[PDB]
Amino acid sequence: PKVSVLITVTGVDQPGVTATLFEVLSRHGVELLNVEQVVIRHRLTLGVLVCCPADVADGPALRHDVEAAIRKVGLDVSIERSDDVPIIREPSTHTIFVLGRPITAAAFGAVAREVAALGVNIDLIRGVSDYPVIGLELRVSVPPGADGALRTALNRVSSEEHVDVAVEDYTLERRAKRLIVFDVDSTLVQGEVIEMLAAKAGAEGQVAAITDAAMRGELDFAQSLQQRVATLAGLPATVIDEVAGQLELMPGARTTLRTLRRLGYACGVVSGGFRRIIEPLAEELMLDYVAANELEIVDGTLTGRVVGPIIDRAGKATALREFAQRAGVPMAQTVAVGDGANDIDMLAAAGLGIAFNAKPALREVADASLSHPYLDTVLFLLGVTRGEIEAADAID
Amino acid sequence: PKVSVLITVTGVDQPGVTATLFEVLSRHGVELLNVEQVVIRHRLTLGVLVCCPADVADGPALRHDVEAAIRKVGLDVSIERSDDVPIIREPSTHTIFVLGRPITAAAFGAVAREVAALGVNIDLIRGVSDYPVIGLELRVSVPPGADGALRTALNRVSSEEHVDVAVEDYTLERRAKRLIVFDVDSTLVQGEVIEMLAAKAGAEGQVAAITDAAMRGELDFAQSLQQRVATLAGLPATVIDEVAGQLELMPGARTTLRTLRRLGYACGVVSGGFRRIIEPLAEELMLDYVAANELEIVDGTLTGRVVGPIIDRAGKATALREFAQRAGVPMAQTVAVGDGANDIDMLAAAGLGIAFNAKPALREVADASLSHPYLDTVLFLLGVTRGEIEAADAID
Ligand SMILES: [Mg+2]
Numbered sequence: 001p002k003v004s005v006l007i008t009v010t011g012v013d014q015p016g017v018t019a020t021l022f023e024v025l026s027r028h029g030v031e032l033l034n035v036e037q038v039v040i041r042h043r044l045t046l047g048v049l050v051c052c053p054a055d056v057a058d059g060p061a062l063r064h065d066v067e068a069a070i071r072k073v074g075l076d077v078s079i080e081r082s083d084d085v086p087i088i089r090e091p092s093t094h095t096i097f098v099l100g101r102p103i104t105a106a107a108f109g110a111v112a113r114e115v116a117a118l119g120v121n122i123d124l125i126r127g128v129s130d131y132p133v134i135g136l137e138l139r140v141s142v143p144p145g146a147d148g149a150l151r152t153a154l155n156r157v158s159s160e161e162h163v164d165v166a167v168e169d170y171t172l173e174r175r176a177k178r179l180i181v182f183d184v185d186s187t188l189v190q191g192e193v194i195e196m197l198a199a200k201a202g203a204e205g206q207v208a209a210i211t212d213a214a215m216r217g218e219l220d221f222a223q224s225l226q227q228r229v230a231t232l233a234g235l236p237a238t239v240i241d242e243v244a245g246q247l248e249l250m251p252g253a254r255t256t257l258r259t260l261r262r263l264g265y266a267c268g269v270v271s272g273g274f275r276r277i278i279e280p281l282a283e284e285l286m287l288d289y290v291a292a293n294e295l296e297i298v299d300g301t302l303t304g305r306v307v308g309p310i311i312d313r314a315g316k317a318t319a320l321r322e323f324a325q326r327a328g329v330p331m332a333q334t335v336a337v338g339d340g341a342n343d344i345d346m347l348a349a350a351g352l353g354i355a356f357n358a359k360p361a362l363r364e365v366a367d368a369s370l371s372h373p374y375l376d377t378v379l380f381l382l383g384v385t386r387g388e389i390e391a392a393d394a395i396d
Numbered sequence: 397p398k399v400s401v402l403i404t405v406t407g408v409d410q411p412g413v414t415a416t417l418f419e420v421l422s423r424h425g426v427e428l429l430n431v432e433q434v435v436i437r438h439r440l441t442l443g444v445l446v447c448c449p450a451d452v453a454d455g456p457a458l459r460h461d462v463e464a465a466i467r468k469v470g471l472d473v474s475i476e477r478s479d480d481v482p483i484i485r486e487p488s489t490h491t492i493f494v495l496g497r498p499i500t501a502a503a504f505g506a507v508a509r510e511v512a513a514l515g516v517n518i519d520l521i522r523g524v525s526d527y528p529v530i531g532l533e534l535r536v537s538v539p540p541g542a543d544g545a546l547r548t549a550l551n552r553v554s555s556e557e558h559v560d561v562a563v564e565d566y567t568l569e570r571r572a573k574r575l576i577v578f579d580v581d582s583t584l585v586q587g588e589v590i591e592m593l594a595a596k597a598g599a600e601g602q603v604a605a606i607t608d609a610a611m612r613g614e615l616d617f618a619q620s621l622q623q624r625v626a627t628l629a630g631l632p633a634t635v636i637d638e639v640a641g642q643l644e645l646m647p648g649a650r651t652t653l654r655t656l657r658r659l660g661y662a663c664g665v666v667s668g669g670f671r672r673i674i675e676p677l678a679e680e681l682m683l684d685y686v687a688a689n690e691l692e693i694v695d696g697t698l699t700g701r702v703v704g705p706i707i708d709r710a711g712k713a714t715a716l717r718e719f720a721q722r723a724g725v726p727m728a729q730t731v732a733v734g735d736g737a738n739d740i741d742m743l744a745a746a747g748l749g750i751a752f753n754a755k756p757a758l759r760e761v762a763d764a765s766l767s768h769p770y771l772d773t774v775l776f777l778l779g780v781t782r783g784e785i786e787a788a789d790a791i792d
Pocket residue numbers: 183184185186187338339340
């Protein structure tokens with residue numbers, strides 16, 4: 001067939017429109033180049049690009065056949081000779097997630113304006129969750145070299161409008177993520193294990209102050225760890241088992257892990273904490289990899305020391321590279337989730353660094369930040385919808 | 397905010413509509429529940445579900461503000477109090493790929509009708525390629541227990557209309573594919589190595605007849621392999637190197653592998669052929685796993701025997717399970733591509749069994765069949781578009 005024709009059907013959705021159009025088209029010489037159809041809120045759009053011999057596109061016969069069929073049932077149709085028209089649209093360059101509880105119109109409006117301001121086209125918008133937060137995705141096409149300006153603008157928008165806003169490369173490679181590590185304390189697990197241990201010794205107050213100082217980046221991590229663990233000197237070592245039994249997962253953790261397993265992820269934890277507490281929990285969640293420091297115990301008593309070497313800021317990033325090497329995963333396809341300045345290097349090395357209810361120091365270097373206390377909002381940044389999670393869990 | 401309102405904007409696409417609507421909405425008390433937007437062939441649909449206090453949805457103020465803003469620039473808008481309306485649509489249950497060169501309207505019409513006949517809703521249609529074949533995807537929602545009827549119907553449609561039609565589960569787990577194996581002969585590579593070797597001995601005719609008999613399922617594979625390899629008895633062993641240098645990849649093979657690497661796949665080959673030929677080629681393509689039989693050589697001469705055990709029909713399936721075990725991949729997340737009755741068990745064991753220009757015996761048990769001589773059409777069945785492949789290759 002010689003020449004191209006574009007047929008576009010719009011109106012209120014009704015059963016059978018799709019089959020009726022192509023059945024009609026088949027009476028003429030029609031081969032398909034492209035078909036695009038969606039229904040949004042009972043509004044149907046059906047765009048069909050065809051090629052027919054220049055011995056039928058000329059013709060009123062095709063036009064009359066289509067127009068009568070479509071108009072009679074109450075929809076509209078346009079029919080145009082194209083030839084200057086793309087067959088298939090290009091892929092989006094980036095995707096943008098907007099999360100909030102609530103997402104105001106003012107906030108989403110602020111996002112749309114910053115996007116428009118940079119010459120960025122919105123290729124699509126859809127919802128990805130209604131729970132535990134509202135989530136929206138926009139797939140966009142960013143002009144070459146505007147990506148940094150875009151992230152900057154949206155970070156300002158996120159801070160002023162009280163929504164989480166994440167910009168991600170939407171290219172084939174950098175969205176085939178296959179490996180994730182979680183920081184434990186205040187990320188996978190609620191609270192700080194070291195503070196729970198210090199409480200037994202009656203030093204919770206001092207240890208929490210040092211902890212907060214360290215997690216904000218104000219303190220050297222290694223020195224901070226030495227000072228805090230020293231506070232435990234003389235405790236019976238069963239304090240470890242106690243604290244282990246007291247641990248509560250971050251809300252959404254079980255959903256997060258369970259969903260990441262479905263997707264074939266390798267899952268691990270990297271922690272400055274203590275392996276006698278972490279490894280036990282890790283086994284129960286059936287994780288793949290654990291890096292943790294180590295408490296010194298003499299005669300069933302904590303000495304107040306940690307066994308070197310110390311997992312420090314650089315150490316966490318090293319554990320990730322290690323994990324990815326043993327896993328066969330390129331750094332670009334890795335994810336890291338953390339909350340403290342302790343996690344800064346690890347997030348840096350990751351293909352996707354996610355800051356979860358994080359200190360300002362971590363948010364400043366993270367690829368994305370989550371501000372709501374639901375760990376499963378991580379899944380939304382990984383291209384999963386609430387609907388898919390619920391569906392998967394229904395089939396058991 | 398108390399009550400729900402649905403706002404729907406339709407018409408010819410123009411810059412700035414998205415930001416304008418939410419900017420207007422922000423003047424009222426508006427929080428977002430869901431946003432859905434697409435443009436197809438310059439037709440815009442923007443559906444927004446909001447909640448505002450029952451102290452503004454009552455009001456003409458919101459309605460007038462929105463209607464004036466939208467209508468003045470030449471689009472339409474409807475505004476309705478909902479409350480009985482879903483926030484977010486459910487995920488599709490399956491996806492359907494239609495491939496052809498050409499895809500006639502009659503063919504696609506036949507697909508749409510069979511789908512409608514089973515009570516299956518078309519949730520979306522899009523193009524996934526314009527080259528080397530036309531490809532279309534339909535995401536669908538299949539009533540519980542109609543899946544088998546659907547596959548049956550579409551197989552009949554595929555056979556009578558000359559298009560490839562594949563139905564796949566669209567659930568989270570069964571679309572996280574991470575491992576693929578290719579049969580070598582007449583799948584990854586053009587022609588049959590055993591026939592190329594037999595040509596040197598002057599027995600190509602007899603060996604091709606046995607080969608075709610075996611690949612149609614008419615012959616026992618092991619016996620067929622013994623008979624054919626015996627034909628090589630007395631050849632100098634450098635025939636192996638000759639044939640190795642003569643091998644040509646299936647069109648699209650390099651694109652296929654290169655794209656599968658981007659997506660973090662583990663890639664391998666399972667073959668009844670000969671490792672001295674295959675392993676060399678496998679190294680050059682940087683594959684992860686090879687299973688192959690073995691030619692017996694005495695004093696630089698082929699004896700006409702293969703070294704046991706023989707990779708047979710069951711053996712190929714076993715090599716896959718093995719590969720997946722060493723890879724940490726569940727069978728449900730594995731893919732197998734083959735052409736002959738020799739591959740039947742391997743395709744069976746795979747989560748996705750793909751028959752590529754295959755004998756009737758293989759097509760009958762395959763999850764999907766490809767009929768065009770382009771190996772990269774495999775990528776379309778794995779949820780990749782032509783656009784994404786071209787984009788990825790542009791960034792190098
Ligand atoms: Mg932490």
